[PDB]
Design a protein around this ligand. Structure first.
Ligand SMILES: [Zn+2]
Length: 46
């Protein structure tokens, strides 16, 4: 029960596809690869 404290830190880069965060750009640009090609996760295994 603080209701107020110091420690407001958030990364500048933040993905919109899923809603993740990243310190550097490249770090995010690389993750964007997942939002480029869909992966077989579901109907794959009967
Ligand atoms: Zn994402």
């Amino acid at each position: 029960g603080s209701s107020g404290s110091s420690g407001t830190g958030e990364k500048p880069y933040n993905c919109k596809e899923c809603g993740k965060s990243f310190r550097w750009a490249s770090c995010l640009l690389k993750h964007q690869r997942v939002h480029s090609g869909e992966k077989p996760s579901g109907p794959s295994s009967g």
